[PDB]
Amino acid sequence: MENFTTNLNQLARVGGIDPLIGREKELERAIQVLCRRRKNNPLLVGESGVGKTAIAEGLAWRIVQGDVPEVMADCTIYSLDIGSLLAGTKYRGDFEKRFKALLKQLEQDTNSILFIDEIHTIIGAGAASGGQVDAANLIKPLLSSGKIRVIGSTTYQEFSNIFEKDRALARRFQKIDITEPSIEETVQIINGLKPKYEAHHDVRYTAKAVRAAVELAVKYINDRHLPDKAIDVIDEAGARARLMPVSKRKKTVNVADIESVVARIARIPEKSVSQSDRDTLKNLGDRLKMLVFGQDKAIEALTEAIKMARAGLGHEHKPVGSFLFAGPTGVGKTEVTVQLSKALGIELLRFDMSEYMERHTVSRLIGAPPGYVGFDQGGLLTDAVIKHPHAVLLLDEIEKAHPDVFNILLQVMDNGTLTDNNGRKADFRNVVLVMTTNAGVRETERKSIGLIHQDNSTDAMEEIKKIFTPEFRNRLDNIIWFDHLSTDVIHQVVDKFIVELQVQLDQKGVSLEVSQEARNWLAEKGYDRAMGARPMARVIQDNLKKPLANELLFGSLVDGGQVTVALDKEKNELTYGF
Amino acid sequence: AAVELAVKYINDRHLPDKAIDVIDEAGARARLMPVSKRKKTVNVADIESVVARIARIPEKSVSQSDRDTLKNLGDRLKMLVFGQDKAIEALTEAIKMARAGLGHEHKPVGSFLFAGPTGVGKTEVTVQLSKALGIELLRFDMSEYMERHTVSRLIGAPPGYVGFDQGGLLTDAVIKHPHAVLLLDEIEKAHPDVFNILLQVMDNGTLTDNNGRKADFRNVVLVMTTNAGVRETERKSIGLIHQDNSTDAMEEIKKIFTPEFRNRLDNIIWFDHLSTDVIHQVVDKFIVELQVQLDQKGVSLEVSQEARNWLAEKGYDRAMGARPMARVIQDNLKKPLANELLFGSLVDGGQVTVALDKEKNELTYGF
Amino acid sequence: REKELERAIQVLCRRRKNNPLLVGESGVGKTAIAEGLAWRIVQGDVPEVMADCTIYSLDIGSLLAGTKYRGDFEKRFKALLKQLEQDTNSILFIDEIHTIIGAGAASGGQVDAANLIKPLLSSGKIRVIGSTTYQEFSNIFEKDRALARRFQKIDITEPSIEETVQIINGLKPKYEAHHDVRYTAKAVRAAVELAVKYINDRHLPDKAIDVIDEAGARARLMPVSKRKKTVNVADIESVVARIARIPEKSVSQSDRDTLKNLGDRLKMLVFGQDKAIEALTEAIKMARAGLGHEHKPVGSFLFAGPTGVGKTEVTVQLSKALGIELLRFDMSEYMERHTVSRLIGAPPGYVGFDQGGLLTDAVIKHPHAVLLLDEIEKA
Numbered sequence A: 001m002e003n004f005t006t007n008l009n010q011l012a013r014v015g016g017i018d019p020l021i022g023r024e025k026e027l028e029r030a031i032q033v034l035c036r037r038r039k040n041n042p043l044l045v046g047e048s049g050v051g052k053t054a055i056a057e058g059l060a061w062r063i064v065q066g067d068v069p070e071v072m073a074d075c076t077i078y079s080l081d082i083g084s085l086l087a088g089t090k091y092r093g094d095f096e097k098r099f100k101a102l103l104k105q106l107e108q109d110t111n112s113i114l115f116i117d118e119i120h121t122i123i124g125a126g127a128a129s130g131g132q133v134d135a136a137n138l139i140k141p142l143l144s145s146g147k148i149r150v151i152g153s154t155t156y157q158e159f160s161n162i163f164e165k166d167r168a169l170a171r172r173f174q175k176i177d178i179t180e181p182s183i184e185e186t187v188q189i190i191n192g193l194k195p196k197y198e199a200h201h202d203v204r205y206t207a208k209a210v211r212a213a214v215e216l217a218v219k220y221i222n223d224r225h226l227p228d229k230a231i232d233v234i235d236e237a238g239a240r241a242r243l244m245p246v247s248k249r250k251k252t253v254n255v256a257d258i259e260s261v262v263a264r265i266a267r268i269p270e271k272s273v274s275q276s277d278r279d280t281l282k283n284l285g286d287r288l289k290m291l292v293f294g295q296d297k298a299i300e301a302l303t304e305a306i307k308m309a310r311a312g313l314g315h316e317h318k319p320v321g322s323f324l325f326a327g328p329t330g331v332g333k334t335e336v337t338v339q340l341s342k343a344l345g346i347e348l349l350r351f352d353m354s355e356y357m358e359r360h361t362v363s364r365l366i367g368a369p370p371g372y373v374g375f376d377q378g379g380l381l382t383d384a385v386i387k388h389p390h391a392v393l394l395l396d397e398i399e400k401a402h403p404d405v406f407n408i409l410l411q412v413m414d415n416g417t418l419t420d421n422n423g424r425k426a427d428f429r430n431v432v433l434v435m436t437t438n439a440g441v442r443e444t445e446r447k448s449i450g451l452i453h454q455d456n457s458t459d460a461m462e463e464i465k466k467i468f469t470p471e472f473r474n475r476l477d478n479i480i481w482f483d484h485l486s487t488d489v490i491h492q493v494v495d496k497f498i499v500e501l502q503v504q505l506d507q508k509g510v511s512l513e514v515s516q517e518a519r520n521w522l523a524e525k526g527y528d529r530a531m532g533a534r535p536m537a538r539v540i541q542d543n544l545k546k547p548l549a550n551e552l553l554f555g556s557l558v559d560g561g562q563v564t565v566a567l568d569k570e571k572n573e574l575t576y577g578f
Numbered sequence B: 001a002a003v004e005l006a007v008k009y010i011n012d013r014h015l016p017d018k019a020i021d022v023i024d025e026a027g028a029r030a031r032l033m034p035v036s037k038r039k040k041t042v043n044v045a046d047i048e049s050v051v052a053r054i055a056r057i058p059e060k061s062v063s064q065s066d067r068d069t070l071k072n073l074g075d076r077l078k079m080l081v082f083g084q085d086k087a088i089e090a091l092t093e094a095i096k097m098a099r100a101g102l103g104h105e106h107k108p109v110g111s112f113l114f115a116g117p118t119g120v121g122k123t124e125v126t127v128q129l130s131k132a133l134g135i136e137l138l139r140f141d142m143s144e145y146m147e148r149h150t151v152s153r154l155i156g157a158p159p160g161y162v163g164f165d166q167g168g169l170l171t172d173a174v175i176k177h178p179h180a181v182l183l184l185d186e187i188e189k190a191h192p193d194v195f196n197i198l199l200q201v202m203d204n205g206t207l208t209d210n211n212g213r214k215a216d217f218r219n220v221v222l223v224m225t226t227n228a229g230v231r232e233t234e235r236k237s238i239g240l241i242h243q244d245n246s247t248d249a250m251e252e253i254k255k256i257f258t259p260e261f262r263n264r265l266d267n268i269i270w271f272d273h274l275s276t277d278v279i280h281q282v283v284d285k286f287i288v289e290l291q292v293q294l295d296q297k298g299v300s301l302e303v304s305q306e307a308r309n310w311l312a313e314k315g316y317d318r319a320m321g322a323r324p325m326a327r328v329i330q331d332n333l334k335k336p337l338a339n340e341l342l343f344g345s346l347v348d349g350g351q352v353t354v355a356l357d358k359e360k361n362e363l364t365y366g367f
Numbered sequence C: 001r002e003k004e005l006e007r008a009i010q011v012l013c014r015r016r017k018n019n020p021l022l023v024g025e026s027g028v029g030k031t032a033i034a035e036g037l038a039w040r041i042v043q044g045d046v047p048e049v050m051a052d053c054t055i056y057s058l059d060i061g062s063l064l065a066g067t068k069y070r071g072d073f074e075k076r077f078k079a080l081l082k083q084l085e086q087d088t089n090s091i092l093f094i095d096e097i098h099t100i101i102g103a104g105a106a107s108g109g110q111v112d113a114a115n116l117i118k119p120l121l122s123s124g125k126i127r128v129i130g131s132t133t134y135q136e137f138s139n140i141f142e143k144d145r146a147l148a149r150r151f152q153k154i155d156i157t158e159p160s161i162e163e164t165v166q167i168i169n170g171l172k173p174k175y176e177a178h179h180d181v182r183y184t185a186k187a188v189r190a191a192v193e194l195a196v197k198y199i200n201d202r203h204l205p206d207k208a209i210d211v212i213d214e215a216g217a218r219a220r221l222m223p224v225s226k227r228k229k230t231v232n233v234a235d236i237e238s239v240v241a242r243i244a245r246i247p248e249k250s251v252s253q254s255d256r257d258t259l260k261n262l263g264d265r266l267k268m269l270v271f272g273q274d275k276a277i278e279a280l281t282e283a284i285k286m287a288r289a290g291l292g293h294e295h296k297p298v299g300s301f302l303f304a305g306p307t308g309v310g311k312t313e314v315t316v317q318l319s320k321a322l323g324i325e326l327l328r329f330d331m332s333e334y335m336e337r338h339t340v341s342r343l344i345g346a347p348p349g350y351v352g353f354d355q356g357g358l359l360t361d362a363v364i365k366h367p368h369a370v371l372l373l374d375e376i377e378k379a
């Protein structure tokens, strides 16, 4: 035992193991179990990071501090490192001699408790031959006879998958469920532990820093439990603050440092909103109007959703915003979204919904159910939002997906979550959801029969309503109708496309000038309300790019020249040059 | 009592030692009593306390603060969910019976199907119930169980398969939290094979997982929500008089959930549409949420009564429930505030006054 | 990678569970950073807190190698940890840290490297820097919750274009030394820009570097015939083009005439329908000229008409004339809605999941190709 276990009273008394705060009921049972006539061995079972070891060792602390029932007073708790019982072995029989020697020592002390953490690891030692499991074979009678007292500890999952197969062991200890504290209990736990962080990091925490670490961690960090989750924030903020005095920036850790840390851990930005990001955001609405012409209202809706979220007036558990972009083809429905993600500097997660035409294609978003082929793959959607929690999520031509696929978004739009096939949750609260569609267009573009042409603008009233179930629609922030582009827009579109052409040419060492007459001509020639801005690229392709490709490819316009294009008036034909 | 209670509440061990353990812990418990110098014998009440602790169930509520918490549970919920009183009452009645002891031998605390128009707090009330009671909410978006084979994610892969150690997500959630509110959202979206899992739960309080262990739902409140019948509810009839289609919505529910399912529910509660009175309450609720969000930035907010009356009058839509009201709040209050909070006077300001004129019915703003 | 290290240091500086885990896509510099810190410590490019501390890199294979008998592994494992605990100013670094979870427990037991490490991380006794990909982190580290709680995940993203150029400028001298080459400024900038435009299934820090290394390696085989030269943008372009399959610079050579005469080689084979020939010929020329569509296909043209008029023959002849692969897809075989899974594959969990997807594999194998979809109206 001398070099296999740790005397926890000795440790708790001299170095300290950090105080245990609260957990009155947890200890009440542990003691009542330890006080039983037989099988007086509690097992602390729970979610990782809830204080299972904190309690098991915390008991040693209470004993050395005298804060125990006299029954427990003066008893010694020893923690066993089973790794050391194997490190000292090699051939047959040495393990058992060593293992039993420790048991004899516990029996001889008579007033001691052994603590075995990771209790599910006591299964082992036997190998090659085996059948002698250690875990049960060397201790079943020790536990059932009351000769020794053992406190164990385990993760709830390990407990059911491993620590629960051996019924004989399952029967020999009383399980105590350690659940995670609530907000207040977490705050008091921090206050009790706080002096150790302040002492370790040479920092001090404000009342708000502590209050906030708990509330913020709960809201933003969701893969850990409260008592160790809020601590990471406090400890991390401490470690960060400790790196300031290096430039003499000695300071108290305040709520501002906590928010910076939570924001970094959760990858959700929070303080830059007060800095230059105010202008990046302020100007967002206009940068996008230089890329998508017309459609200002779509730009505003996106811009507004983002501003509210950055302002802090977002929702508590919804995507940044979620609206469907409907309209005629070639009017900037996907273009504004692509540009939004560029303007914001964030990842664009683009899915083509045309690929999800069968009901069973949902498995590509979620992953196969356990037990199936594609299980370890995970889901493509849930994974995309996990790697990039701050993103623009674009679902192109959503009306092409099998309609049951839309059901996947009900919980996304409403709770910001989606659960993958491993049970992990996607978190969409920092994702802008944009879905585009051509629903209703075929109808809006149809001519009616009669003397008076009917106004078919109520496409929203039929196709959008028939395609998207009421519960889907009622979760959208908006349904935004993109219009056909006007001729004023076409002129802007043509200018835009010519610039794109100029850039491709600049990269080849040549440049292009187009006269205004030539531009107006191309705009006038290509406009077709029905196809939006889509054909303008073809008009440019035929009137400017084809001529240029011949000049670029066969030597007429290569190194040494530039091309000027002008329109004549007689034929309205374009000129070219060098 | 140790013997007859252990067989009812402790189900992972055989009787000899299962009952002795109750006796032994009760013994130890009583042994730790005369430290206060109060000598004890072990009565039925001490046995019941031990079983309650071993089985992870509630003991006796009348002398507890739980008595008061339970007594006015309906009142607190009515402050969060307006209207739909009958749903609130059904939930609290089932709970009271269970704590009263007038429960079921082997069934969930109660089992309800929440049906009705959208935007009505079918989900909202369940979420608040778990908060009001202080217990874990176990959620399961049923839209994610659309294929016959998705059942294995609820109960785990069969042994020997790639998803065998993961276990089931449902049985594990229940095992970890035996006393909980279990919410199955949009249950009608799940593949019907899923309902077969629910039928046995509703009748026995239990599911066997892929490890052969059982989840005990005896202390779980089971609420599942649905939109079955909504498209029909919102349909307008042909004629001069619009018809009440709630009767057809039920026909839709009865086609999705077969008699075998329906007979295992304690109730099917058809939630009604929200009234204008409710909207006024809803608007105040949303404004308060806004005020809280603003307080977090150090900004106070006043909204006049007329501004409230107007927002409520503007946003009400009987068919869409309360969800649109939040849209009204975003456009009339949050957007203006975001600009002031982000680029203007409220950054280090801290105050905003909102009222409207009568001539334009436009809102005021500013520090 | 200043911020990536700032966080790593802040994690190492924590009181407990001060073990950063570097998680990211492959080829993004995760291990470059962990080794980079050892480099910075030695060079004095780190806070005094890290200064003078030793980072050791663990060979899991040598730790497990030879551990026969019951107890040798456990002994070696513990000896290592003891040595680290007695150093008091060291950090252990583990590549592919998810593999520690698979350390050899001898038999049916659970005593292995992860179970033996856990208490020393919780206690703050030792410091470990881990490294794993987002996929290995998800399928391995994410599952062992207790171990995962002892690491602080650092999210390492792919660098920008400007950042990639800068790492090349820093790394460059070693490629120059290794290959006996020198790289021009244009060569470096282009490796990054071109790799971004043309090389898929890789991340920048690696993608640009791979081009620099190969181009250096190409030039390394020139002064064997004493064709000594530097690596210019043209050589970088050639290397990327090897992968991209359509060079932007060779278009200026004999390729100009191969392309110029394309229209006539096709007119002599397909008669009438000159307009189809022109449509195809022009699309290619623009694409080779550089007047492409940035992200769209070379061109997409529906050929409609009476039978026996050369609609598929001209496309077949095009692929022949160009010297490129013809990918054929008979649309009549996709006569039903569900037949789409033949083109892209079955969803995960379904029979045939690992069979592939005919269209996506055809295109992936042959990036430069003519894709012909016969009788599209029959799909």
Ligand SMILES: Nc1ncnc2c1ncn2[C@@H]1O[C@H](COP(=O)(O)OP(=O)(O)OP(=O)(O)O)[C@@H](O)[C@H]1O
Binding pocket: A018, A019, A020, A021, A022, A023, A047, A048, A049, A050, A051, A052, A053, A054, A055, A058, A155, A189, A227, A228, A229, A231, C145, C146, C147, C149
């Ligand atoms: N009363 C408490 N005493 C000590 N620690 C507590 C307490 N309550 C919560 N904690 C938190 O839990 C941790 C205490 O250590 P503990 O051994 O209990 O972890 P754990 O719950 O067993 O997690 P794991 O399964 O990974 O070992 C600390 O992070 C601490 O912030």
Ligand SMILES: Nc1ncnc2c1ncn2[C@@H]1O[C@H](COP(=O)(O)OP(=O)(O)OP(=O)(O)O)[C@@H](O)[C@H]1O
Binding pocket: A291, A292, A293, A294, A295, A328, A329, A330, A331, A332, A333, A334, A335, A336, A436, A438, A485, A489, A492, A493, A496, A532, A533, A534, A537
């Ligand atoms: N308002 C606009 N300003 C400038 N260019 C535009 C505009 N609208 C469309 N375009 C042009 O069309 C493209 C933008 O993509 P767009 O959003 O129109 O796709 P879409 O609306 O989804 O149509 P589809 O039905 O084919 O998917 C760009 O090439 C862009 O030059």
Ligand SMILES: Nc1ncnc2c1ncn2[C@@H]1O[C@H](COP(=O)(O)OP(=O)(O)OP(=O)(O)O)[C@@H](O)[C@H]1O
Binding pocket: A471, A474, B080, B081, B082, B083, B084, B117, B118, B119, B120, B121, B122, B123, B124, B125, B225, B226, B227, B278, B281, B282, B285, B321, B322, B323
């Ligand atoms: N009776 C109510 N009182 C106040 N707010 C309500 C009420 N009912 C619904 N709401 C509003 O709805 C919001 C939550 O939506 P809810 O949970 O009710 O949708 P649902 O019941 O699931 O219906 P569906 O999903 O079919 O659209 C609440 O935050 C609340 O603002």
Ligand SMILES: Nc1ncnc2c1ncn2[C@@H]1O[C@H](COP(=O)(O)OP(=O)(O)OP(=O)(O)O)[C@@H](O)[C@H]1O
Binding pocket: C269, C270, C271, C272, C273, C306, C307, C308, C309, C310, C311, C312, C313, C314
């Ligand atoms: N314009 C042409 N000039 C010379 N030969 C030709 C022409 N068209 C077709 N042919 C010949 O006739 C045969 C059929 O040609 P092809 O398959 O390309 O026509 P198609 O448009 O595909 O008809 P289908 O409607 O059946 O698909 C080929 O062997 C081809 O050599």
